[PDB]
Amino acid sequence: ETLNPSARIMTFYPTMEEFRNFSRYIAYIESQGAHRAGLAKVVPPKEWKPRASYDDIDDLVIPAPIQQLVTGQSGLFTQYNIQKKAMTVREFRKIANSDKYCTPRYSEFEELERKYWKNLTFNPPIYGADVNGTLYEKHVDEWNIGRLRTILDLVEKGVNTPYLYFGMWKTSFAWHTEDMDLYSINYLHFGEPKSWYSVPPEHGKRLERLAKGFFPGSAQSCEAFLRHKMTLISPLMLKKYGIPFDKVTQEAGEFMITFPYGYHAGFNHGFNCAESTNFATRRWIEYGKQAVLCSCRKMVKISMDVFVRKFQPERYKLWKAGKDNTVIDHTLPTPEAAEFLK
Ligand SMILES: [Zn+2]
Ligand SMILES: [Zn+2]
């Protein structure tokens, strides 16, 4: 509780030596209290690049582009997806950069953020979201989203596969926590920034109660309605109801790490491409066992049995009998962080 008591978004600048071991570096950032914010930025060393150039991807297919329609007022909004037919990056970029969809003129982010919240319900943009794939060159061994090497790999017969996100101005991701309340890594390959809002995991339940109060219909219909990733809540609305939160802008060539039960939302500044996947550490096991799941959709559900038998052998019979009353401490870093804490 002494490390990062403010639970503010921390930024890391690892050397090539530090950066070479992904799982170890996550354990390090946690020993620094990075997890408490629910979100962290990792700026990689200058010499590291996951691909030589991105000039060969015009004919890359976006199977299911989604037009994002937003309904709402006074900081509370619902976002509805409309699947459009398959489009290429070339066609997406032309639309993203056109007069109708391009980024407005702004001097500072605060101005762009004001334009976003004022106009998110108008001129619905198209998000080239959830594209199965990677932009990493096969030889890249450091922080390869396709092959991280974390303990989530134990799931051996799509939380372990990379996804691509081609953004345009005003495209957004609603408040949510990862599936099974897992960790996530996001690399911004190129283009305009992506702004993020984060709620510290220790205050996550405060946000859920706020969301439950504002949408009582959706709350009854599904035990975890925020998992539908349709709910947009403005920073002003969070302020008005005392929800502690922080904000950060991710730029091209930067990573973002989301931590278990760390609620996040955000939006794209203009044409860009992010790559993302989920991941785990020993700390996540308890979060996965205690995760409240979407009950209205036949969703991403992992069996926790293999994880409990391997990393909590003594707890197996107790947990399986339904007697495991473990209370998660959100401030506590992952067991692997011990070498950085001594
Ligand atoms: Zn996410
Ligand atoms: Zn549901």
UniProtKB/Swiss-Prot annotation:
Ubiquitous. Fe cation binds at H176, E178, H264. Zn(2+) binds at C222, H228, C294, C296. Changing G128A: Abolishes histone demethylase activity. Changing H176A: Abolishes histone demethylase activity without affecting ability to bind H4K20me2. Changing G133A: Abolishes histone demethylase activity. Ubiquitinated by RNF8 and RNF168 following DNA damage, leading to its degradation. Degradation promotes accessibility of H4K20me2 mark for DNA repair protein TP53BP1, which is then recruited. Also ubiquitinated by the SCF(FBXO22) complex; leading to proteasomal degradation. 2-oxoglutarate binds at Y127, N186, K194, K229. It is found in: Nucleus. Interacts with histone deacetylase proteins HDAC1, HDAC2 and HDAC3. Interacts with RB and NCOR1. Interacts with VRK1. Interacts with FBXO22; this interaction promotes KDM4A ubiquitination. Histone demethylase that specifically demethylates 'Lys-9' and 'Lys-36' residues of histone H3, thereby playing a central role in histone code. Does not demethylate histone H3 'Lys-4', H3 'Lys-27' nor H4 'Lys-20'. Demethylates trimethylated H3 'Lys-9' and H3 'Lys-36' residue, while it has no activity on mono- and dimethylated residues. Demethylation of Lys residue generates formaldehyde and succinate. Participates in transcriptional repression of ASCL2 and E2F-responsive promoters via the recruitment of histone deacetylases and NCOR1, respectively. The 2 Tudor domains recognize and bind methylated histone H3 'Lys-4' residue (H3K4me). Double Tudor domain has an interdigitated structure and the unusual fold is required for its ability to bind methylated histone tails. Trimethylated H3 'Lys-4' (H3K4me3) is bound in a cage of 3 aromatic residues, 2 of which are from the Tudor domain 2, while the binding specificity is determined by side-chain interactions involving residues from the Tudor domain 1. The Tudor domains are also able to bind trimethylated histone H3 'Lys-9' (H3K9me3), di- and trimethylated H4 'Lys-20' (H4K20me2 and H4K20me3). Belongs to the JHDM3 histone demethylase family. This is Lysine-specific demethylase 4A. The chain holds residues 6 to 355 of 1064 of the full protein.
